């Protein structure tokens, strides 16, 4: 089988810049290369066929080039909505194969998260466990730190978090962190706090609530 190597693994760029993705074939494949865009939770979308031929409905800023083993997908003046995974596929030799993809990331100015804390619902408490949630909304860069404190004791090992993909319009990220406690431990304490640190904040921001109040 033909192996396609895409580089770089992650391409970070600023809006308006011209960007280029590399796809190198393990053997010559002529111009038998197709490119796809794949947005978060979307299905692949065909951008260019046969190395450089355009597809109906694809924005003019996308183009492709290359012949032999070295191929390039280009975006002249990239836009925030171009955030996605990009893949090349060769079909000069059966079976058709695809690259591992290059993820495109958009740089943007630093933006501090807006923070919100949510107490467990009474409905869930009836189940024996309490989930406490902290939301870090629309920030940049991706790196952020959430620390959970219960009556001022730092929690460790009982929280899990996930982060959205970059927003297609403002290029920010959002983060959700869940602190899980048993109903018994939850009822034994009063002050629940989520403290976050981020490049965009001068000092940490903490949101909290008092069980019951």
């Amino acid at each position: 089988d033909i192996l396609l190597t895409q580089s770089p693994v992650i391409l970070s760029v600023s809006p308006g810049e011209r960007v280029s993705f590399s796809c190198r074939a393990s053997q010559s494949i002529g111009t038998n290369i197709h490119w796809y865009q794949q947005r978060t939770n979307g299905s692949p979308r065909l951008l260019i066929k046969y190395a450089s031929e355009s597809i109906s409905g694809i924005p003019s800023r996308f183009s492709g080039s290359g012949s032999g083993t070295d191929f390039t997908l280009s975006i002249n003046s990239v836009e925030s909505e171009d955030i996605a995974d990009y893949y090349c596929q060769q079909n000069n030799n059966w079976p058709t194969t695809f690259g591992a993809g290059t993820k495109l990331e958009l740089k943007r100015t630093v933006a501090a998260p807006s923070v919100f804390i949510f107490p467990p619902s009474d409905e869930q408490l009836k189940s024996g466990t309490a989930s406490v949630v902290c939301l870090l909304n629309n920030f940049y860069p991706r790196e952020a730190k959430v620390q959970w404190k219960v009556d001022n004791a730092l929690q460790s090992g009982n929280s899990q978090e996930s982060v959205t993909e970059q927003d297609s319009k403002d290029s920010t990220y959002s983060l959700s962190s869940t602190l899980t406690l048993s109903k018994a431990d939850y009822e034994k304490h009063k002050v629940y706090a989520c403290e976050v640190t981020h490049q965009g904040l001068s000092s940490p921001v903490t949101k909290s609530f008092n069980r019951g109040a």
């Binding site: 066929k49 079976p95 807006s114 919100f116 869930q124 909304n137 959205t164």
Partner: protein, 221 residues
């Protein structure tokens, strides 16, 4: 308009069989082949096979013995069936159509079917509210949401106000809990003064367990 629509996501037990249906419209199966491609979590694409216009099939080498593709031209349906699945086969499976009858530039794709291969069993979620309050109004803006907890397998669909509320919605990647069940949050930020006159409903649907819940989320205090 050319379209491919696939059957729902679901759990398959190790060593058992996987079966998916791809229903097409806007073109006839007698004039185009339909290919199958899968994508493993955080991975690339892998072409699996194709059933051509005339009914012939081609399977990629690794699946030659455990894959079979059939179709019903009259029903515009294509059937994918693969045998003896292992954990390794957990992935999103897509059917697709090329630009031309004999080619492989895939211009049209189905929405994909997430197939999880695990010995566990299917479990519907519990939907709990993530409610704002006095201590939730960031410059007149409040955040509210739904915690979709303890379900399996993935995925879960979450919309707000039946799709009418999209602005400011963030539905997060699910996390696998130590219990082996997933948990996901979906939030939206709204003007705090709208909490009185507008209702906020998260619509969640966990197809593997055929569980649909519409949950209103309101502040408690």
């Amino acid at each position: 308009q050319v379209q491919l629509k696939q059957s729902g996501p679901g759990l398959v037990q190790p060593s058992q069989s996987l079966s998916i249906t791809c229903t097409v419209s806007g073109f006839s199966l007698t004039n185009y082949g339909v290919h199958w491609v899968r994508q493993s979590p955080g991975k690339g694409l892998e072409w699996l096979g194709v059933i051509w216009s005339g009914g012939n099939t081609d399977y990629n080498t690794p699946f030659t013995s455990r894959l079979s593709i059939n179709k019903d031209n009259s029903k515009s349906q294509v059937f994918f069936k693969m045998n003896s699945l292992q954990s390794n086969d957990t992935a999103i499976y897509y059917c697709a159509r090329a630009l031309t009858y004999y080619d492989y530039e895939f211009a049209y794709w189905g929405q994909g079917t997430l197939v999880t291969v695990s010995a566990a069993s299917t479990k519907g979620p519990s939907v709990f509210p993530l409610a704002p309050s006095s201590k939730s109004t960031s410059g007149g803006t409040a955040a509210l949401g739904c915690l979709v907890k303890d379900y399996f397998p993935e995925p879960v669909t979450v919309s707000w106000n039946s799709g009418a509320l999209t602005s400011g919605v963030h539905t997060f990647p699910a996390v696998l809990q130590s219990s082996g069940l997933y948990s996901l949050s979906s939030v939206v930020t709204v003007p705090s003064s709208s909490l009185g006159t507008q209702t906020y409903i998260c619509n969640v649907n966990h197809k593997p367990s055929n569980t649909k819940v519409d949950k209103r989320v309101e502040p408690k205090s």
